[PDB]
Design a protein around this nucleic acid. Structure first.
Ligand SMILES: [Mg+2]
Ligand SMILES: [Mg+2]
Ligand SMILES: [Mg+2]
Lengths: 244, 240, 394
RNA sequence: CAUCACCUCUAGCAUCACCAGUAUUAGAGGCACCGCCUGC
């Protein structure tokens, strides 16, 4: 009793936890075992996460505390194996809190699809996961279609895809903006040699820029015209799925 | 094939043991690793990677005096001959090690950290955080397997609940128990990677044969071909 | 830890026994009656076999603990092949002696006058060196296992020609293939020295004492230097199967019982097989101590006390080019304690008889730079060799 | 063709190759030293 309470507060003091956070960590748990609570806290510290982000992520979701000790230690070994650690895991946690709860093979297929099917470098895979955590939630088939769309139809190579945060954006908005640019003639698909008649607009201009500003910068078309295209493109896409 | 491994000796000794080359051939006799063959003959010097190995009649912390730091052909780093009590054995030398120096080997984990000296062997539970370490082991009694190469050094990132995070030279974190024995400091031959082979002949002196002359269009990205999806199959190549 | 010996090189596990043996009350059918192997029959279990008679060519010794001379306490044996790690410093502690640089004044004063020098001494030593390394054999450059012993036998023979001046050299011989044993304790450590090899100069009269009574009594203030963490018994043959026995090497009645000088030779072609100068002097001290200790025990019994008449034994160790001289005086036989009377040892280190020898002329650009013969010959080195041989006869 | 040099890719580990080795390592490759210039 007393020793269990003494070691919980003592351990958090050793890890640099703030006095307010230590009291909150006791309040965060809902029936969790004391040592099990410490193991979940310590496991996050093992991955290099600072105490301040530790309190924030536990505050949002209490399901992390009520997890088997074996599963998280097995997961944390897998997380560091693929290159996630201090700093990088912080972005993944608040964007994708479901990472710990999701099954291991779901993550394995996602990374293997990038490494084998998409032929992404292991260094590039870690950057994508760190920057774009929506990849894990995304379905494998839709993700694979999104990647090959940029590689073949758009002509974007592997290093540019990782740096430009392409995979995080929705597939639908990519189709709307790219095809409209392609039909406008402003975008030229690279040939077999890779040359283009006209320098294609940079990927940041296409996707990062807002819809209203995107038209003015590159498309040079009015807002009303683009709205009609989206309805036309949606009908073509809807017929495309039914036809195939 | 009638292949018998030369690694048949069962008793440790500091005597250089004659070893026979493989040439990249496995026990079957076929090539399994390419580019290996020939070179100057070498004698293997057995290395005791378990720094904390107290004698049969002794126990606990013990001390060893370095006799000589010499060149080892088998490994990139240099080795040191140390004598503790009535025995002598080979260990992996650190960057700053000379003949006459005294190293300490202990398995004690004190309440507070201790002044870490280069070349000494202490458990990971008694070393200050951030100190460069080398020749680490996964579990107690396993023996040093990581951070062996010349100049390599790990980082004691953190220690929580009897476990410690070790930053490997490949910038990868590893979690092991705090009772693992590690060596303080870097490994010898820091400027080993700064060597210049000079001529193709010196690579044949190290037992490395020239690469195959075939022009391999295959590679990490060139050889492996992403299969185009039927929708994207139309846009793969456009005449120009 | 990492075990030595891969499992492929070890003896394979015997095949699992046939399941017919696991059924009680069932006699297996094996090929033991056919006297040869067949695959469709069970493997018989052969009982252990004994030859039934003693065959020297196929004899197997009993287990080590079954040997009659088996003791739990280990005995560390020092022999000709032992190479001490600390050299002299380790040898001084085992023998409980104090090191004194330089040979004694009395020994060196024998050859101080020109009256005891050999006629044409400088020319005679040069011809001994030249014969050993150039003229000895048909091959141009003889190996060290050939000239190392010869260069020493000739020097002894050269010093043995002074019987004309000193009639007292007719009471000494040179014994080959002589051995000795000596056992003692050093802080509850049973040690034994078994010297062999080299030449043992024997004399009918014991060597006179070197140090006076007051000089011997002044060794009580001296303290032996330690070499922690290295143990004093390192690089020694730790054997549990031994026999504590004192042996001077000769039976009672030998006309030349008292050893005069031990000649040690490092006649090995390979440099690693040759003792280092620090290690060679360590071997000399232990062998000089071992030979002197056997005489003390033979004459004064197997007790442990300060000898009334200390025994002096000389030793000369050479590599064929470098000479080491030792004069060991045994002042006590109670070596268990580190206090009290300690022995004395006069040692000369790294005495070059010649710097280098050219068996062939060095011709550079058709110019003879170095002629055949020794280079850097030091006649002073041979004087020390002559003084030790003339000790006890002048 | 190979070649030092450079560059890419893969791998955090032991009892038959790699290796009785451990990322200053090993393997799969490109190019052909060095020096200058350049991408990012
Ligand atoms: Mg190559
Ligand atoms: Mg090529
Ligand atoms: Mg070429």
């Amino acid at each position: 009793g007393s020793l269990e309470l003494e070691r919980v507060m003592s351990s958090l003091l050793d890890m640099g936890f703030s006095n307010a956070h230590i009291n909150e960590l006791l309040s965060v748990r809902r029936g969790a075992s004391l040592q099990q609570l410490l193991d979940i806290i310590s496991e996050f510290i093992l991955l290099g996460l600072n105490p301040e982000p530790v309190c924030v992520v536990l505050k949002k979701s209490p399901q992390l505390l009520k997890l088997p000790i074996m599963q998280m230690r097995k997961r944390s070994s897998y997380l560091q194996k693929l290159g996630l650690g201090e700093g990088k895991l912080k972005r993944v946690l608040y964007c994708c809190p479901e990472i710990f709860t999701m099954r291991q093979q779901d993550i394995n297929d996602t990374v293997r699809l990038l490494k084998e099917k998409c032929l992404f470098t292991v260094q590039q895979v870690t950057k994508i996961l760190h920057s774009c955590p929506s990849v894990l939630r995304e379905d494998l088939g839709q993700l694979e279609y999104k990647f090959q769309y940029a590689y073949f139809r758009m002509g974007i190579k592997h290093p540019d895809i990782v740096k430009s945060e392409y995979l995080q954006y929705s597939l639908t908005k990519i189709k709307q903006r790219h095809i409209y640019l392609e039909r406008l003639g402003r975008y030229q698909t690279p040939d077999k040699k890779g040359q283009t008649q006209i320098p294609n607009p940079l990927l940041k201009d296409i996707l990062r820029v807002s819809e209203a500003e995107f038209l003015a910068r590159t498309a040079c078309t009015s807002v009303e015209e683009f709205q009609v295209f989206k309805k036309l493109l949606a009908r073509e896409e809807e017929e495309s799925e039914s036809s195939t | 094939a009638n292949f018998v491994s030369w690694k048949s000796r069962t008793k440790y000794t500091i005597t250089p043991v004659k070893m026979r080359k493989s040439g990249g051939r496995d026990h079957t006799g076929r090539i399994r690793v390419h580019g290996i063959g020939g070179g100057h003959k070498q004698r293997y010097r057995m290395i005791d990677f378990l720094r904390f190995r107290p004698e049969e009649t002794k126990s606990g912390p013990f001390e060893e005096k370095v006799i000589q730091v010499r060149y080892d052909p088998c490994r990139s780093a240099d080795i040191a001959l140390v004598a503790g009590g009535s025995r002598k054995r080979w260990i992996i030398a650190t960057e700053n090690m000379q003949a006459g120096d005294t190293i300490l080997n202990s398995n004690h984990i004190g309440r507070m950290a201790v002044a870490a000296r280069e070349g000494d062997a202490h458990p990971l539970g008694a070393l200050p955080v951030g100190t460069l370490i080398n020749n680490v082991e996964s579990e107690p009694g396993r023996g040093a397997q990581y951070i062996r190469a010349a100049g390599t050094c790990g980082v004691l990132l953190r220690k929580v609940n009897g476990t410690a995070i070790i930053q490997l030279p490949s910038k990868r974190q590893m979690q092991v128990l705090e009772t693992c024995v590690a060596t303080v400091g870097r490994v010898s031959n820091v400027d080993h990677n700064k060597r210049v082979i000079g001529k193709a002949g010196r690579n044949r002196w190290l037992g490395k044969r020239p690469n195959s002359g075939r022009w391999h269009r295959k590679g990490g990205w060139a050889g492996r071909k992403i299969r185009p999806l039927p929708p994207m199959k139309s846009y793969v190549k456009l005449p120009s | 830890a990492y075990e030595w010996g891969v499992r492929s090189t070890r003896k394979s596990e015997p095949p699992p026994l046939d399941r017919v043996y696991e059924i009680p009350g069932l006699e297996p059918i094996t090929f033991a009656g056919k006297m040869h192997f067949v695959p469709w029959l069970a493997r018989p279990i052969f009982p252990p076999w004994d030859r039934g008679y003693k065959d020297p060519r196929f004899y197997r010794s009993p287990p080590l603990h079954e040997h009659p001379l088996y003791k739990d306490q280990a005995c560390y044996i020092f022999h000709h092949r032992c190479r001490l790690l600390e050299g002299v410093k380790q040898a001084l502690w085992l023998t409980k002696t104090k090191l004194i640089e330089g040979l004694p004044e009395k020994v060196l004063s024998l050859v101080d006058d020109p009256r005891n020098h050999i006629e044409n001494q400088d020319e005679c030593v040069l011809n001994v060196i030249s014969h050993a390394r150039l003229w000895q054999t048909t091959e141009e450059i003889p190996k060290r296992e050939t000239y190392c012993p010869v260069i020493v036998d000739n020097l002894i023979q050269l010093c043995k020609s002074q019987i004309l001046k000193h009639p007292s050299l007719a009471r000494r011989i040179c014994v080959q293939n002589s051995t000795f044993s000596a056992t003692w304790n050093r802080e509850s450590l049973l040690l034994q020295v078994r010297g062999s090899g080299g030449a043992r100069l024997s004399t009918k009269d014991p060597l006179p004492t070197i140090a006076s009574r007051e000089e011997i009594e002044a060794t009580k203030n001296h303290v032996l230097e330690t070499f922690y963490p290295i143990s004093p018994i390192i690089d020694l043959h730790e054997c549990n199967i031994y026999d504590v026995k004192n042996d001077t090497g000769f039976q009672e009645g030998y006309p030349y019982p008292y050893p005069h000088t031990l000649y040690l030779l490092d006649k090995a072609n390979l440099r690693p097989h040759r003792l280092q100068p620090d290690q060679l002097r360590a071997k000399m001290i232990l062998f000089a101590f071992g030979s002197a200790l056997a005489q003390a025990r033979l004459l004064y019994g197997n007790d442990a006390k300060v000898l009334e008449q200390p025994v002096v034994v000389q030793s000369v160790g050479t590599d064929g080019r470098v000479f080491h001289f030792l004069v060991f005086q045994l002042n006590t036989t109670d070596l268990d304690c580190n206090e009290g009377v300690k022995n004395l040892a006069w040692v000369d280190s790294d005495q070059l008889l010649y710097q280098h020898f050219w068996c062939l002329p060095v011709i550079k650009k058709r110019v003879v730079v170095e002629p055949v013969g020794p280079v850097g010959f030091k006649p002073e080195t041979f004087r020390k060799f002559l003084a030790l041989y003339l000790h006890g006869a002048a």
